[PDB]
Design a protein around this ligand. Structure first.
Ligand SMILES: Nc1ncnc2c1ncn2[C@@H]1O[C@H](COP(=O)(O)OP(=O)(O)O)[C@@H](O)[C@H]1O
Ligand SMILES: Nc1ncnc2c1ncn2[C@@H]1O[C@H](COP(=O)(O)OP(=O)(O)O)[C@@H](O)[C@H]1O
Lengths: 55, 371, 55, 371
C-alpha cells in the first residue's frame, strides 16, 4: 500500500517533469531559431559594412 | 506451402512456422547424458536427453551446449537438437518444408557449409537459406536503416544498415555475452559463501541472473549506495530451500558488458563498440544511425540497459545529435520474428537454395551469390 | 513482488527524467546567454552600420 | 622487530619467524574434546586439547577440524588454535610481532575480515597482512613466472602468474584435496574388510595414505598388473596389529585427483584444470607457463604425481611445446618458505596493515589496497 502511494506520487512527479522538459524543449527550439536568424543577419550586415568601407 | 523458421543461436533454440506471430517451440539447446550408473533394471533409461527434458533431470545429467560462440562444436549433438526440434517439439516432417536458418556475422565458413550439408542430406529438406541475425532484427523492428546491437548468449555484434544496404567493413563482433556473464556471476557469488560448480548449478545461476540482475545508471554511485545502505539486497530461493541474499552482485554482473576488463578481456564496452561502428561508417548516414539504435537478443533485456547505453553513447557522440535506443519488450524474439516476416515475403521465394541446386553445385552454393 | 517491481521501475524512471531535466535547464540557460550575446552584438553592429550610413 | 609467518591451511598449522629456512612449529589443526565419562577424581583433566597433544589422546577425544575447505567454520576453535600456536608452540607475545597470514584464492570475504578482526582485537598484534598461498609458493620457488598448482588438504587451485602480474580471470579453484582422498580411501578399504569409522581412525587412515599411496603412470595397466600378479601388495601395522594388506587401492586413492568422478564430482582432473587455466590465459605467455608448471602443498607429495601430470599435460598441449613440472622436495612447506621471504623483504614493510589504519577504517581495510 505504501508502494501504491509512492507510485502515485512518482506518476504525478513524472507528469510534472514531463511538462517542464517539454516546455524547455520548445524554449530551446525558439532560442536556437532566433540564434540562427541573428547569426545570419550579423553575417549579412558585416558583408554590407565591409563592402561599404571598401568603397 | 509453409516454411520453418529455426533460430538456433546458442542457449535457446526457438522454432516455428513462417507467417506466425511468435515461435511455437522455445527450449534450451542442451544435451544431457547420465553420469551415474543406474540400478533399477526395467527403467529402460535412455542415453541422452535433449531440450527441456534435460532441464528436469539436471540432478543426474551432465549438460553440454553444442554451440560455444555462434559456432557449432558438437555436430552429433546439434543433429540431435535439430531432430528433437523437428519431430518432438513441432511434430512436422522436414521433407516438405523449406527451412530458414540463422547465424551471426563473421563466423567460420565450414560452420555454415556443414549446416547446409546436414539440412540437405540428413533431413532431406526441399530448400533452405541462412540469414544474418541482425538483418532479421531490423526486419522485425520495422526499420530499414539503423545500427542493430544483437547481444545473444554466445556472441554480441553490431551491424549498421542504411536504406537496406549493409556496410560490412563496419560490422563489429564481440565474444562477450550471457554465458560469460553467467560465469562471472558464478565467480563473484563465491565472495559471499555460495558455490555453484556443477554444469547443473550453472542453470540455477542463470535463473538468478535473469531474475535479479540489472544495469546501474551510474556504477560508482550504485557501488557507494550498496556499500552504505542495504536497500538493494534481494533474496533468491534455491531449488531446495536455503534462501540466498545478493546485494552488490546484482549490478556488478551486467556491468561486465560496459567494462569487459572485469573478465580480463581487453575489448571496449558495448557503448564504445557501438559508437566505433558508427564512426566507422560514412559521414552522411551517422545521424540516422544515431537515431536508430536497435537492441535485440536476450542479453539486452536487463532493466536499465537502454538508459545506461543511451547515457554513455550520448556522452560519446557530439552534443548536437539526437540519440535514441529502440528497445521493444519482445526483444528476445526479434530475430525469429524477422525471420518469419522474411520467409513469408513473396519476393523471397526466388532466394531459397533448392535441393537440385545443391546437388548440382555442392555445399559451396551457400556462400555463392545464392547466399 | 508486483508492487516492488512497479515502484523500482518508476523510481528508475524518476532518476532518469530528473537527470534529463537538469541538463535541459542548464543548456536552456546557456542558449539564453548566447542569445543575449547575439542581441548585444546585433545592436552594436547596427549602430556601426547606421553611423557609417551617414555617407 | 620480527614478523611471524603463520600458514594455517586446512589440517596442518605451521608457523615460525620471518627469516628462517623452515617453520619451527608444525602440528595438526585439530581440537579434541573428551567424549567419555571421567571417573578419577583429582585427575584435574581439561576440557579441550589442541594440536599435537590431541593426537596422543585420540582414543578418548572427538576430533574437530575448524577449517573445512579453506573456510573457517568454527571461530572459537580457530581462536584456540591461534592461542596455542602463539603461546605454547612458539612462546612469543603476539602484541609485539607483526603477523603474516595466508588464505586460498576465491574465499568468502567475511573469512578474511573476521580473521583480521580477531588478530587485532583478541591477540592485539601491531600489524597484520593476508597473502595468497600460490604467490608465496612462487616466491619460494625462485621464479617470477609460472602456473602454480597448490594442492593443500582442503582446497586445490591454479594461479597463473607472468612477470609478477597475476591473471585473476584464469584462477581455478577445486574443492578436491587430501581430506577427500582420505575419505575415499576409508570408503574403499571396506572392500577388504577393514572398517575405520571414528574420527580417531580417520587419522590412522591418513597415515596409511601418506606412507603407502602413489600415483600410477598408467592407470589401466596398473589395474591389470594388480589383478594379475601380487607384487604391489604392501602391509601396514595398525596401532595394535592385524597387519592390513593393501593392494590396488595403493594407487586407486590418489587417482581421484585425475578422475574426480570416483568421488562423484563433475569437475575435471588437476591436469585438465591446469591445462584449462593455461588456455584461459593469453597466447603470448602460454609457452613460459608450460615451461614453469610449479607444484606445491602436501597433496602433491605422492610418488609419481609429477611424471603422471607431465604425461597428461604433454598429451594435451601441442607437440611443439616442452612441458616441465617443477616439484621440489620441500613442496609441503613452500607456502611457508615464500611467506618468510616476503615478510623479510624490506620493500614489504610499507605493505603491512597497521593497527591505527584498522582502528580508523574498520575491518574493510583488508580488501582495500592494503590487500
Ligand atoms: N530477463 C533477462 N535478463 C537478463 N538476461 C536474460 C534475460 N532473459 C534471458 N537472458 C539471457 O539471455 C540468454 C539467451 O539469449 P538468446 O536471445 O536466447 O540467445 P540465443 O538464442 O543465441 O541463445 C541467456 O543466456 C540468458 O542468460
Ligand atoms: N607424503 C605424502 N603423501 C601423500 N599425501 C600427503 C603426504 N604428506 C602429506 N600428505 C597429505 O597432505 C595433507 C596436508 O597438506 P598441507 O600441506 O598440510 O595442507 P594444509 O596446510 O592446507 O592443511 C594431509 O591431508 C595429508 O594427507
Amino acid at each position: 500500500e505504501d508502494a501504491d502511494r509512492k507510485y502515485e506520487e512518482v506518476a504525478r512527479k513524472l507528469v510534472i517533469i514531463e511538462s517542464d522538459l517539454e516546455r524547455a524543449e520548445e524554449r530551446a527550439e525558439l532560442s536556437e531559431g532566433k540564434c540562427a536568424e541573428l547569426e545570419e543577419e550579423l553575417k549579412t550586415v558585416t558583408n554590407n559594412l565591409k563592402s561599404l568601407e571598401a568603397q | 506451402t509453409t516454411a520453418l523458421v529455426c533460430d538456433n543461436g546458442s542457449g535457446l533454440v526457438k522454432a516455428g512456422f513462417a507467417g506466425d506471430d511468435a515461435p511455437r517451440a522455445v527450449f534450451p539447446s542442451i544435451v544431457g547424458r547420465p553420469r551415474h550408473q543406474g540400478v533399477m533394471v526395467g527403467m529402460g533409461q535412455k542415453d541422452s536427453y535433449v531440450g527441456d527434458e534435460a532441464q528436469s533431470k539436471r540432478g543426474i545429467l551432465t549438460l553440454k551446449y553444442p554451440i560455444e560462440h555462434g559456432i557449432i562444436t558438437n555436430w552429433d549433438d546439434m543433429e540431435k537438437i535439430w531432430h528433437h526440434t523437428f519431430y518432438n517439439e513441432l511434430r512436422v516432417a522436414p521433407e516438405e518444408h523449406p527451412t530458414l536458418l540463422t547465424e551471426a556475422p563473421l563466423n567460420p565458413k565450414a560452420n555454415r557449409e556443414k549446416m547446409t550439408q546436414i539440412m540437405f542430406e540428413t533431413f532431406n529438406v526441399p530448400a533452405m537459406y541462412v540469414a544474418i541475425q541482425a538483418v532479421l532484427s531490423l526486419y522485425a523492428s520495422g526499420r530499414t536503416t539503423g545500427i542493430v546491437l544483437d547481444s545473444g548468449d554466445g556472441v554480441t555484434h553490431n551491424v549498421p544498415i542504411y536504406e537496406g544496404y549493409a556496410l560490412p567493413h563496419a560490422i563489429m563482433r564481440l565474444d562477450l555475452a550471457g554465458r560469460d556473464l553467467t560465469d562471472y556471476l558464478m565467480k563473484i557469488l563465491t565472495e559471499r559463501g555460495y558455490s555453484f560448480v556443477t554444469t547443473a548449478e550453472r542453470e540455477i545461476v542463470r535463473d538468478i541472473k535473469e531474475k535479479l540482475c540489472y544495469v546501474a545508471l551510474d556504477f560508482e554511485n550504485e557501488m557507494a549506495t550498496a556499500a552504505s545502505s542495504s536497500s538493494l539486497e534481494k533474496s533468491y530461493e534455491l531449488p531446495d530451500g536455503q534462501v540466498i541474499t545478493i546485494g552488490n552482485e546484482r549490478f556488478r554482473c551486467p556491468e561486465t558488458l560496459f567494462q569487459p576488463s572485469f573478465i580480463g578481456m581487453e575489448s571496449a564496452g558495448i557503448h564504445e563498440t557501438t559508437y566505433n561502428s558508427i564512426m566507422k561508417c560514412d559521414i552522411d548516414i551517422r545521424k540516422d544511425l544515431y537515431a536508430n539504435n536497435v537492441l535485440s537478443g536476450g542479453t539486452t533485456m536487463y532493466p536499465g540497459i537502454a538508459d545506461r547505453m543511451q547515457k554513455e553513447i550520448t556522452a560519446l557522440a557530439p552534443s548536437t545529435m539526437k540519440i535514441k535506443i529502440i528497445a521493444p519488450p519482445e526483444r528476445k524474439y526479434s530475430v525469429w520474428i524477422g525471420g518469419s516476416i522474411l520467409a513469408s515475403l513473396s519476393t523471397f521465394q526466388q532466394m531459397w537454395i533448392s535441393k537440385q541446386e545443391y546437388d548440382e553445385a555442392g555445399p559451396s552454393i551457400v556462400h555463392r551469390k545464392c547466399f
